[PDB]
Amino acid sequence: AHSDTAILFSAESEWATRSMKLNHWHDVRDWYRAFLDAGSRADIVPLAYDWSSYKTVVLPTVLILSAADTQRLADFAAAGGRVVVGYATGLIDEHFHTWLGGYPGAGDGLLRSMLGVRGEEFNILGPGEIRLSSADDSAALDGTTTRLWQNDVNVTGEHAQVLATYAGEEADEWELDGTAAVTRNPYGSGEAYFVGCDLDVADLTKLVRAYLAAS
Amino acid sequence: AHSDTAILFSAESEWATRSQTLPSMKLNHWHDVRDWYRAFLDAGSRADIVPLAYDWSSYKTVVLPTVLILSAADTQRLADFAAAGGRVVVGYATGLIDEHFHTWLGGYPGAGDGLLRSMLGVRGEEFNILGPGEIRLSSADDSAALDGTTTRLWQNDVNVTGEHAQVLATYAGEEADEWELDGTAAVTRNPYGSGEAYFVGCDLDVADLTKLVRAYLAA
């Protein structure tokens, strides 16, 4: 049906570079010529389209890269796909704000971690006590309490599942009603749990038995 | 012949615990380790306590309770461990300070300049508890594929961090020395889950770019 390689075209990146040594469409065009002369002709596919069935995706000077699209690349790679990232990819988010932190900055470090490389910058030279409630249908952490918790927690991962939240009258007094307390997130082929509060051994055992035990 | 779960112990984090300089005296690394140990024991799945510096790559799950001090290299070890299929459990007070005892900047949790946040899929703003002109390339492998290729647009700031990341080409030659780039990574690839991620740090013309595709990205 289609080729094994997709060269992703971003209309937003073309709009951004068309307004100085960067040119998204010219970079896509050269990568297309390269794959053509190499005998493995590639397709040109819009970034927003479903390219999950391709074996390789190429992102040449895709300047604008959202966290949602960075997650799609990570999912694509983790499931066995091959991702090729140019030097000028993932520098700015979808709201035209520069990705802070190390280079490349797309996804608050998710793209950087996929590549296994890091640069410092893009540089081209020439309430007292709170009760918890299980968010899933397990009721394992219901009735548990905490006396020291992290207050500023935002669930940002697309595939991050909330396992428990702070609830009750005491939780609402600090504007923490519904705030995430225990979460888990897929990362590559693995997983990462976040425990946002202190728990006694009794409550920890219920957390371990419900999610981390061998049984 | 050990357990599936390892609770990591950081001596430096215990030192920061003893300093009594944290926002709460309840922050205690070793006491958090003991509580997690008894929790895993009481649940019928006893976990081992392994020093952070040791090789825990053979475990299936790794737990970091109040590991306040996390270097960039250790955060990278967790990312490599997790991206290959491992499970990582991160406590609320883990990864706040780097190995030089400086607060990690850029958000919460700050370890890895977003690497820990990316793994966890969770971000906070802060810890807050209540209660020349042309350069040649040289192939870093033995394929000698990208040898003789040049570039007039390159990224100077590139450093390889992943344990399994492989450099495929570097900048070499007299012109690369003037930019202090003799040895800097130009083309790398890194395994991520079941797949792969390449980084192309310089602009190549169609002729040289065809060499790259045919060597690594062709059928």
Swiss-Prot record, chain B:
Protein origin, superkingdom: Bacteria
GO BP terms: carbohydrate metabolic process
Name by which UniProt lists this protein: Beta-galactosidase BgaB
GO MF, any single term: beta-galactosidase activity
Protein family per UniProt: Belongs to the glycosyl hydrolase 42 family.
Assembly information from the UniProt record: Trimer. Tetramer.
Organism annotation: Bifidobacterium adolescentis (strain ATCC 15703 / DSM 20083 / NCTC 11814 / E194a)
GO cellular component, one term: beta-galactosidase complex
Gene behind the chain: bgaB
Role noted for this protein: Involved in the hydrolysis of transgalactooligosaccharides (TOS). Highly active towards Gal(beta1-4)Gal and Gal(beta1-4)-Gal-containing oligosaccharides. Low activity towards Gal(beta1-3)Gal, lactose and Gal(beta1-3)GalOMe. No activity towards Gal(beta1-6)Gal, Gal(beta1-4)Man, Gal(alpha1-4)Gal, Gal(alpha1-3)Gal(beta1-4)Gal, lactulose, 3'fucosyllactose, lacto-N-fucopentaose I, lacto-N-fucopentaose II, cellobiose, maltose or sucrose.
Post-translational modification: The N-terminus is blocked.
Span covered, complete protein: 409 to 633 of 700
Keyword annotations of the record: Glycosidase, Hydrolase
Organism placement in taxonomy: Bacteria, Bacillati, Actinomycetota, Actinomycetes, Bifidobacteriales
